Amino acid sequence: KKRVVVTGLGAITPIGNTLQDYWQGLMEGRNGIGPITRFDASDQACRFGGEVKDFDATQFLDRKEAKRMDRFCHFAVCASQQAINDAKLVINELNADEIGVLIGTGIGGLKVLEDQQTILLDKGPSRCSPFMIPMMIANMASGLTAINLGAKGPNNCTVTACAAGSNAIGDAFRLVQNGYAKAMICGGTEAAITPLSYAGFASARALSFRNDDPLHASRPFDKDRDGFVMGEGSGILILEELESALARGAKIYGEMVGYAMTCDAYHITAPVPDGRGATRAIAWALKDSGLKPEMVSYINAHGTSTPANDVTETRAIKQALGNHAYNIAVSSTKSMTGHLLGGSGGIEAVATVMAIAEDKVPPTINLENPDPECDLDYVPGQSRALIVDVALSNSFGFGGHNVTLAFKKYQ
């Protein structure tokens, strides 16, 4: 198996529109949650979320191209450009065939779907946009990114809800490990802060309804948590075969070493009580990496701030790491960014890789009183200096997908 290193990172999030701003935000416990402005949410059960602010796609994309793509693609393409520039990776006719793209999303172009359905009902099917399909479908993020960057290698798209970005990075990792690509632009993206998305997640009673105090709604592991807080954005990584990376003197953040996927085959949205699947995902990600649980330094938890997830995940971490679970640092950055759904795995992988390189872990803000069963060190309040030798990123998404990614310092 080829070794795979992370050579570039890009991010557009509710707390920063660049890698630097995003990381600084995480280090300062920046809060990206606030009242919804992208649409009139006055008639919604949840009226706040984590929106990307001060972002203009036309600053980075050709005007006509930007006009012909949805926001979820704006994020993916722009975050990918960031990653490529960060990596200083030059893509030309000579290496284009060995560089692919794998960007996942959970819902894709919902905005287009809503706008077009509204048109269909009001003006008739003949008035619908001829660009509806190529702007709406989930794989457009990967497709448009490849066209923008000139990547002609494997181009795929994983749609596994909250785990979309993690599965994308994991699958890209395999492509490089198995020699099907020398480099992969991968991660996740989501721009689902829309009336229908909010209506659906609110109806399912999945979203926090703390409209009176949006700044403290997202509180992973806290006893008073009442649902996740949606966010939007994209996180992208450049995974590269070690020899190729070294040959060009690539910047190296760390090495990706493990990936595991399991399924509870229990319930479509509710996690299994004993957290068996999540436990196995963590245990197998470690086995895939040839690492013992005691080697883990930090875990960027899924920690969505829902009653069921946070305690089940804590149980899984404790079952997978044993007593060592109490000797590591765990934190949910969703406390600051909100749950980016398909994009969560992307920006969280970015945060995890940065932690490995910076020896600093982001906090779980808003955590005041954790449930008795959420008794680990969740790095509450402020970021903390810590030697991060091995770090995991968890994604336990709706649909029953349990995914864990493992990274470690490059040596």
What are the catalytic residues? 162, 302, 339
State both tokens at 130.
């001829």
CB of 155 or CB of 344, closer to a second copy: 155
CB of 130 or CB of 249, closer to a second copy: 130
Pick the stretch among 96-104, 237-245, 319-327, 376-384 that binds a second copy (CB under 8 A): 96-104
Query: Least distance in Å: CB of 268 to a second copy?
Result: 5
CB of 5 or CB of 149, closer to a second copy: 149
CB of 85 or CB of 203, closer to a second copy: 203
CA–CA separation, 91 vs 114, rounded Å? 36
Query: Least distance in Å: CB of 350 to a second copy?
Result: 21
Alpha-helix runs per DSSP H in 28-125 = 63-67, 71-87, 110-123
Q: Which residues, in sequence order, are CB contacts of 63 under 8 Å at separation 6+? A: none
What is the C-alpha end-to-end distance of the chain, expressed in Å? 17
Q: Judged by CB under 8 A, which of 33, 83, 87, 151 binds a second copy?
A: 151
Task: Quickly list DSSP for 380-402.
Answer: BSS-EE---SEEEEEEEETTTEE
CA–CA separation, 113 vs 367, rounded Å? 37
Q: What is the dihedral of CA 223, 162, 347, 278, to 10 degrees?
A: 70
Binding status of residue 143 toward a second copy by CB under 8 A: yes
Residues 311-370 that bind a second copy (CB under 8 A): none
Q: Which residue in the block uniquely carries the two structure tokens 């949205």?
A: 269
Q: Report yes or no: 80 and 10 within 8 Å, Cβ to Cβ.
A: yes
CA–CA separation, 98 vs 81, rounded Å? 17
Q: Judged by CB under 8 A, which of 400, 404, 405, 407 binds a second copy?
A: 400
CA–CA separation, 324 vs 305, rounded Å? 23
Q: Judged by CB under 8 A, which of 118, 327, 369, 382 binds a second copy?
A: 118
Residues 174-233 that bind a second copy (CB under 8 A): 174, 178, 180, 195-196, 198-206
Pick the stretch among 25-33, 137-145, 326-334, 377-385 that binds a second copy (CB under 8 A): 137-145
CA–CA separation, 264 vs 251, rounded Å? 38
Q: Report yes or no: 190 and 201 within 8 Å, Cβ to Cβ.
A: no
Residues 237-266 that bind a second copy (CB under 8 A): 261-266
Read off the amino acid at residue 279: T
Q: Judged by CB under 8 A, which of 13, 31, 82, 156 binds a second copy?
A: 156
Residues 263-282 that bind a second copy (CB under 8 A): 263-269, 277, 280
Binding status of residue 157 toward a second copy by CB under 8 A: yes
Binding status of residue 93 toward a second copy by CB under 8 A: no
Binding status of residue 234 toward a second copy by CB under 8 A: no
CB of 48 or CB of 253, closer to a second copy: 48
Residues 19-58 that bind a second copy (CB under 8 A): 43-45
